[PDB]
Amino acid sequence: PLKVEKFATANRGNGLRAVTPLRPGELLFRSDPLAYTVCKGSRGVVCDRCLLGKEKLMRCSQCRVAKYCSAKCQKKAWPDHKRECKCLKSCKPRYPPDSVRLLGRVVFKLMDGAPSESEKLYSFYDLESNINKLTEDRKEGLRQLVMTFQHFMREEIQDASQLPPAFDLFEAFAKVICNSFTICNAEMQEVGVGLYPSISLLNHSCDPNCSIVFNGPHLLLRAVRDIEVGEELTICYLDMLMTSEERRKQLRDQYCFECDCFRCQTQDKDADMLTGDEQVWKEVQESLKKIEELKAHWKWEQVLAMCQAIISSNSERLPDINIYQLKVLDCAMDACINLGLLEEALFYGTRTMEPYRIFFPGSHPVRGVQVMKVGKLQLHQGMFPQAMKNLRLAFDIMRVTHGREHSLIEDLILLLEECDANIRAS
Numbered sequence: 001p002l003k004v005e006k007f008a009t010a011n012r013g014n015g016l017r018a019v020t021p022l023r024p025g026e027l028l029f030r031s032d033p034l035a036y037t038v039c040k041g042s043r044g045v046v047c048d049r050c051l052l053g054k055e056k057l058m059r060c061s062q063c064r065v066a067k068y069c070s071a072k073c074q075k076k077a078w079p080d081h082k083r084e085c086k087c088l089k090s091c092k093p094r095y096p097p098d099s100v101r102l103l104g105r106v107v108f109k110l111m112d113g114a115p116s117e118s119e120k121l122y123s124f125y126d127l128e129s130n131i132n133k134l135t136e137d138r139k140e141g142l143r144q145l146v147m148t149f150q151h152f153m154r155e156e157i158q159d160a161s162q163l164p165p166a167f168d169l170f171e172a173f174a175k176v177i178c179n180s181f182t183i184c185n186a187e188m189q190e191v192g193v194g195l196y197p198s199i200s201l202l203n204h205s206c207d208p209n210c211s212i213v214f215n216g217p218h219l220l221l222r223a224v225r226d227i228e229v230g231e232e233l234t235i236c237y238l239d240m241l242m243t244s245e246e247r248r249k250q251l252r253d254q255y256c257f258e259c260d261c262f263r264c265q266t267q268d269k270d271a272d273m274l275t276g277d278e279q280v281w282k283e284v285q286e287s288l289k290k291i292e293e294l295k296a297h298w299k300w301e302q303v304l305a306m307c308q309a310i311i312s313s314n315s316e317r318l319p320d321i322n323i324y325q326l327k328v329l330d331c332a333m334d335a336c337i338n339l340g341l342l343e344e345a346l347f348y349g350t351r352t353m354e355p356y357r358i359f360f361p362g363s364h365p366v367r368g369v370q371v372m373k374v375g376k377l378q379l380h381q382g383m384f385p386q387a388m389k390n391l392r393l394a395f396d397i398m399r400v401t402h403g404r405e406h407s408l409i410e411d412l413i414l415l416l417e418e419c420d421a422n423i424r425a426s
């Protein structure tokens, strides 16, 4: 039985609204992707199917590009991998953009005759493209992408005849621009990109009543506050650590709309985000573009050196609550976890808490995860009474954001049970 339903909104295309009263944490929808792929910087670092990052992965024999964690994952990914293998093989070492690879998998799933669970409420053909709202430099960009697709897909596609009508390459790339989902791992690292057309019904807000989490490529939609009958359901398309000037820019350029939400109109939290001197944090912002690029490719040691440079150089002038400084700590923390330097990770991680509490109000999955990491590190250091508080706080959030269907909740409980035992012992 469905608690959500499609409806035409006043002026923001189609939307999704409640059919029944919904309480925080309530599971609204479950979907696997119509199609999905590992994103560029996680390829050969994580498994192509399940998106987990083991020590050694086994490559595909035919192309050597796809990489898997096990035989079971290589078997079950084959249907999706089958008809792209030769294209990956011939292009080497050249890799196409993620959208090209994504669409290459989609185009075949659309001829698949069996109805797609993910398209239950909304199809791929329903997705908004914003054709009539696009600027010239994006149209030109989309034209280049069509050409790349055409050259990348020679071995399997030669002509528009080999694909359904009603499908248009150009139009399809436009859909992709504003209907993509960035699949994140349990750690909240960006590992993939995929299409979930039913979930694409949800309009954006900077103060959403709903949230999504990824458990592997599986997606869960959950309410994050009390929601009344008939109330439109919204999510945030964007990372929380962005100013209202920065949010409006991305939503304009990528989603062809001016955000009119409360937070955008009232500069909500902008002053706290930009605490400190401009001339100082402008440099941090600049350094971040490189930093986030290296983190994308899992280059933890280079990430650390760059983060350490900035932190010790700014300690006397730039406060932590400055989103740019804040992002630098979070990268630095993540680098250390992946590098085994757990003492240091907690030093960095601990400084992010109160800024996160302020910037992630209520229940947000990124915060829940962040508190968990700091709680987990505090457990490893023998700081049992502090870890117990943070892991309980992590649960409070993640009960709402992750729920019992997400497998990370199990891990959290085992940490809490391990911490409770470490407390009762000493």
Ligand SMILES: Nc1ncnc2c1ncn2[C@@H]1O[C@H](CSCC[C@H](N)C(=O)O)[C@@H](O)[C@H]1O
Residues within 6 Å of the ligand: 011, 012, 013, 014, 015, 126, 127, 128, 130, 178, 179, 200, 201, 202, 203, 204, 205, 254, 255, 256, 257, 258, 259, 260
């Ligand atoms: N707050 C908002 N204001 C105006 N338009 C919005 C919006 N949030 C989302 N949209 C629109 O929805 C698109 C994202 S997909 C959301 C579903 C879309 N309304 C549809 O009918 O298919 C964006 O490209 C934008 O056109």
Ligand SMILES: [Zn+2]
Residues within 6 Å of the ligand: 047, 048, 049, 050, 051, 052, 068, 069, 070, 073
């Ligand atoms: Zn796997």
Ligand SMILES: [Zn+2]
Residues within 6 Å of the ligand: 060, 061, 062, 063, 064, 065, 066, 081, 085
């Ligand atoms: Zn292959």
Ligand SMILES: [Zn+2]
Residues within 6 Å of the ligand: 205, 206, 207, 247, 259, 260, 261, 262, 263, 264
């Ligand atoms: Zn907004």
